[model samples]
Target: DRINTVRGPITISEAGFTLTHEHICGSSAGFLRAWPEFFGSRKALAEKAVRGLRRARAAGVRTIVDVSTFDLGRDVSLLAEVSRAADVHIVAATGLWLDPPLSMRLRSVEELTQFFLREIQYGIEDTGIRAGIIKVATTGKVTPFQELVLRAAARASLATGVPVTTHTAASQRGGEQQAAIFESEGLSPSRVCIGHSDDTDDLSYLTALAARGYLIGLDSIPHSIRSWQTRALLIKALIDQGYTKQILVSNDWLFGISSYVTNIMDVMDSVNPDGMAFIPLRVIPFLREKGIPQETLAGITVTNPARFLSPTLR
Candidate 1:
């Protein structure tokens, strides 16, 4: 099986030690419209991203899924450059984030489905860089418009065989609702990843989703060691129950923002300098200390992502 990357397709086995969620660079569409240089020049963005990814490469990370959607200012060209310079595989996504624009809301489910299919089958913005995953989101609650988007995402995955990753407000039990919609679309739960599960310590919610065969994304590794300890405990709880195969771990870290802050790189580094390397550098050791076996840890970072992302590619 081959997963589409910024450079091109690679075998599933090649997607080694992958992070399922991260952004190469992003900014709100609104801000970019007002200030085209909000994220600074392409050189500024690449310098920040390549340096961070190189550190991750040194720490044994091979692939990263940049889940920043079109609305979040996904830049495939920039991703290609950073990925090449850092020698890391980068997978792009096509879909919507938490809030859909008014124009998007006006479209029908069928219309949105076609749009996603174009990106998957053809390419994103005519760059010929096909997205390997479909990403959707639900925050606080799924607005009626978001429901349309969710259905479209399911239909796109069904059509192209690409996997769907999601952003869920776990405290709101948002993944459950997302699962219901996907199920209604006749999508296998195995084809879906319910992300941001680390936001809540609700064992039952995570356990239920995992039990149903949905990939649980404990992907939000924060900068704090204290937070990592809490997430490590949660991972232990999940592994202890025989659900290790369904777990995916990553950092929702972004390399650069378009606006609303100056020297964004320094600010982000001050908060969590590890960037994409956090899991390998910090979380894994703690996970081992928590009694998680090496094989389980490997599956979360390596096998699980390949397995989840390869279905469509196969």
Candidate 2:
């Protein structure tokens, strides 16, 4: 009955809800790196992030899994402050990200594994911040480095009993690669969630992952990369495959500027336009309209993530 993190156990009330993946803080990689000039300064960035977090709370989101990995401006201190203020259980992550230069500078795979394990065991250990889950990623192409990181993540999960979640490249093969590596490392597929699956239009690929007991994370709800209609079709197909219980959803809506200055303006402009709106005005209603049963929607938004974050899993 325990959820994602054990900051405390969450009992399912009729009103309980959860967001399996999201970012309440800023991101430092990917699109962010493409435009450092427009990125907001640290001071401006933190303030803007705080505003967004408050809005999410007001929208009735009871919990969120913040997967801003290393060098992604995780800002655990800021997350802690915001979680306290908003009374939300913010499950933070510990692991690597996908930017080249940054990824190149990371510790060796073995060292990375040990670091993630310690973070899960001791709550960021020396940093005084708690990491509720282990995070890792793969470039869509399954590069050697991506395999190394995945292995490291699997090792940490096995050692600490923490469930591992991954950001897969925008390719269907990413999930397949993640599953292969995790299995090679002798890890439980059920304890892993392959994120960013929405980027691909292949239903068989997603069902393959779910069939293996891995969670198919269908985040990327509002991005231009994938059309909403495609996402809706895939969701419906997955449900028809009897894999609803193995799916998770989130917006991956990161606030604040990216590293590329020129793109920073666009990032800022992309905000809810109303400023700091967390649960997009359309999200809840969209799910309802999509024919997602209220109970299933509640599980995806709340119950499933809560179970993933629980210390019992660890």
Candidate 3:
């Protein structure tokens, strides 16, 4: 009744040391772009994901919100095995990413709404693992089609009671536009996260979103968007500005994304390295050195995400 994961529902307390944004390896519309002959088995992705989760658990990770949407390889079926093997809870999502499929363009908003609702209520592709969140993205700018999908995502969230999450390029002021869209739909901005906020250092912009009750995702900790130091410092700054409860920390990492890549090295080169573990393994310590409070750390990684990802309808 609290949050649904591939393993089943759990209280927010059970969702200890959660990573609000992350990825798991599996085949989906993304890797389907590969040559047909290259597709074979999900075994490779599962093995890699399992190993990473093991290490993550060792670093005190107990649950992860896998934000991989339908277009970017939302494979709950494969993630089921990975979660079991790694002994971790995975909260999967339903919706679209930045680059939508042709069907999304063709579907009416109601059609899209029912599609995502089906996943949230029933299961993802018959796996019986209901999606915990609805995802939408605006990478460059909010196109008409993307706006339609965001509206659909809002409708689905209302109908299903699951929270909504977003991907944004905040340097382009994308979060502000996204926040406005959600608000126009009469959705609570607090129910959404303006993702990739860590990609920028503009406190005024991020604080504005937080002030309006939206959570900011300081995800992509290991990426090259800016220095990792800036990411840590940004969190401290936000906490100082009284956004402690509205901040989430994570790494938007993936493994073995391509369906055709036969070699592990090729896939390794393609996706993020150490993103799954970087936050706890490195950033957390670095954050403490900067004199951030222990309670704030717990809130950012554990309590805050549970609040964001928790089902609101009930």
Candidate 4:
């Protein structure tokens, strides 16, 4: 299994110790236009990305999946530069984002599939950096436009053999619906991961997704109310229930991929726990303290990422 990275496809084993989701950048054109200074220029944000990714590298993180969709300003060239500067693998994504404007949503799913396919088959924006995954999202409910994006993502995944990662309204059990849609579109659930899963602790809901072979993201580290221990124990519980490989963990924070959340004043400047080094510095150690075996922890950070990112999707 070749793991696509900014450095090109590294051997699956070389793609060690990965954080399955995170953003290195983010800002819609409207958001930036509304408050130019808040989002900063691309060059300015690129520097910050370099600094943060370097910090993660220093903390022993080997790779990060940057789920920055095009509409959110996915800068493949900047991502390549940041990966080189930080000496870490930055896996870029290809697919439409949720909440696309009317101009984008009006396009047919076939048109959207072409846009995403070119990135995975060729390269994103001619940067020569092929995307490693297909990323799509849904909010409280899967709107028609969001559903179109998901189906386009599914087509892109099957077309290029890239896996899919998703954002779902976990509070509303959107993951259950997400899995159903992906399956209907001809991609197996093993080829997808339902992100923000740690947002809820409903075992039955999570297990149901796992039952169909979906990878559950125990991401959202340092969220408002979810404690570090709570997230760790959830991982522990899934592992105890024999769903270890079906779980992928990350902070869902950004280091190049754009996030609208970063546009808020004072947010781009914070040294938030999920900022950098959260997993290596805090989350992993916390899991160890809870008696999670080192090997099991490695499966979450290393083996699972390689598996999911690879064609194996095992």
**Number of the top TM-score candidate:** 1
Best by lDDT: 1
Q: State the lDDT of candidate 1 residue by residue for 1-314, as single tens digits.
A: 88999999999999999999998876655544465465576677688889999999999999999998888878788889999999999999999996567777799999999999998999998799999999999866678888888999999999888999999987799998999989999999899999988888789999999999999988887735346779767788899899999998998888887634677666877888788888899889998887778888898899999999885623
lDDT of model 4, residue 311: 65
Candidate 3 lDDT:
0.82
lDDT, candidate 2, 190-288, per-residue tens:
789899888887777888889988888887766655566567566667877888778787777766635345465465446435332333355556666
**Cα shift from native, residue 254, model 2 (Å):** 1.3
lDDT of 1 at 4: 97
Judged by lDDT against the true structure, how good is candidate 4? Answer: 0.80
- Superior candidate under lDDT, 1 versus 2: 1
lDDT: worst 10-residue window of model 1:
29-38
Using all chains and alpha carbons, the TM-scores for the candidates as numbered come to: 0.94, 0.84, 0.92, 0.91
- How accurate locally is residue 215 in candidate 4, as Cα lDDT from 0 to 100? 96
Residues forming the 10-long window of minimal summed lDDT in candidate 2:
271-280
lDDT of 3 by residue, 129-168 (tens): 9999888888667888898889999889887678888888
lDDT of each: 0.86, 0.68, 0.82, 0.80
- Encode model 4's per-residue lDDT on 1-314: one tens digit a residue: 68778779898888888988887766552443345455466567668778888888888889999987877766677788889988889899987666577778798999999988888888877678899988999977688888888899888888777899998878899987778789898898888999989888788898878878999998876654666668667788888889999999888776432344444425534646347578788888888888889999888888889889986423
Residue pairs in candidate 4 whose N, alpha carbon or C atoms collide under 3 angstroms: 23-254, 23-255, 24-255, 24-256, 24-257, 25-256, 25-257, 25-258, 26-258, 26-259
lDDT of 4 at 290: 80
